[PDB]
């Protein structure tokens, strides 16, 4: 029964207890049945908030480290802490990715959820790439790229440019081009393409999904303005 | 700054931090 | 780990918004038996206030959801069990804090600043317990909160000027205790109002070091007064 688990997941969401939420959705996912759209959103929100605190913490600690004098006696404590945080982040991303490869992607039945999960794969492989080094960094960046590319093609073939999932995939994939590959022009072109194509057919968009698509598009042109500086 | 990405994270006033 | 490095990691954890680690550090420092500076005490307060706060807010959300109508006895059972789990966590936190206070901090403080700070803290966490308590446990928790608060209040009034930030914050939290725990809005209003009036009375003589804090606290007192006058 996923019903009680979903109930608890929503309670946790409103209570901002995202560990509990991620537990609930992990259990549901492991029951083996395909996830509905609300349930996919619950999974994504849960693990997004779990990993988020560690991404931000890691950013802070790393910033402090790289602005600390190398001869400082207090450097190794900073290092050790950053490495602990990084370890937790790796643990979480690995959990998500195992959930995707073992359950969700293997059993996804419609293009919407397949694109959703592939996008997620790219997102969390990207979260790993942000903190990886050496060959590990090469291969993790590669996996992220591949997930994003597959999801991108499928979205182009099976969805409208106004679909919130397609738009979000374009947003995050552009950010992958900017922060990871370091090609700001291509990231700008992804964002602008998605935005223009969305406005073109904004009239074929669902009233209920309107708020979501609008939100994403605003993030897209926000990114565009930023990067163009 | 950090680029934006899709999925994002009466009472009485007692003494705060 | 040495006290110095424990502090270093408490501050680093605070920068990282990782308050469980911060609270663990400061708990270690406190258990080492050493008296804490003002800075270190504030690290303790920030850490544990952040740890407990999430539980308090979650408990509020879940409780509110529990009062929703037309809900299945089954769903209601699930909601209540979750609220009970959060309650358990909260009680554990407040318990740890109070064990630190009675066992180390309050015990080894003759200094009025520290004595008032720790007694106030005790009243605070016993109040956090009182807002989720049942039956006789409830009366005991309330009496303990009120007692600690009262002792802090007396010590402050005998040892600290009205403009001092701990005296003011103490008045604030003690009056919120009167309003929310004892449901005596009149005495809460007079408590806060007396604090504020006594502060403004001696504001021109306040030093420019504690001005920044006591002004903010005073504004909180007035906020609660205005809110409590509907």
Residue numbers in the entry:
A (entry chain A): 2 to 230
B (entry chain C): 336 to 344, 362 to 369
C (entry chain B): 1 to 230
The authors write:
Therefore, to study the binding of 14-3-3θ to the pT340/pT360 and pT340/pS366 pairs, we determined five crystal structures, allowing for direct comparisons of the structures of singly- vs. doubly-phosphorylated complexes. In contrast, the Sites 2,3 (pT340/pT360) and Sites 2,4 (pT340/pS366) peptides bound 14-3-3θ with ~0.5:1 stoichiometry (i.e., one peptide per 14-3-3θ dimer) and with more than two orders of magnitude higher affinities (Kd of 45 nM and 67 nM, respectively) than the corresponding singly-phosphorylated peptides. This result suggested that these doubly phosphorylated peptides occupy the two phospho-S/T-binding pockets of 14-3-3θ. Importantly, the structures of the singly-phosphorylated peptides display distinctive features that are recognizable in those of the doubly-phosphorylated peptides, for which the electron density is asymmetric in the two pockets of 14-3-3θ. Although the sequences surrounding pT340 and pT360 are closely related to each other, they are distinguishable by the presence of two large side chains in the Site 1 peptide, Y337, and R344, occupied by smaller side chains in the Site 2 peptide, E357, and S365, respectively. These distinctive features of the singly-phosphorylated peptides are clearly discernable in the structures of the doubly-phosphorylated peptides, in which each pocket of 14-3-3θ binds a different site in an asymmetric manner. In the structures, ranging in resolution from 2.0 to 2.9 Å, the electron density maps revealed the phosphorylated residue and 3 to 5 residues N- and C-terminal to it, whereas the ends of the peptides and the flexible linkers between phosphorylation sites in the doubly-phosphorylated peptides were unresolved. In contrast, the titration of acceptor-labeled Site 2 peptide into the 14-3-3θ/Sites 2,4 complex did not produce a FRET change, suggesting that both pockets of 14-3-3θ were occupied by the doubly phosphorylated peptide, and that the singly phosphorylated peptide cannot outcompete the doubly phosphorylated peptide from either pocket.
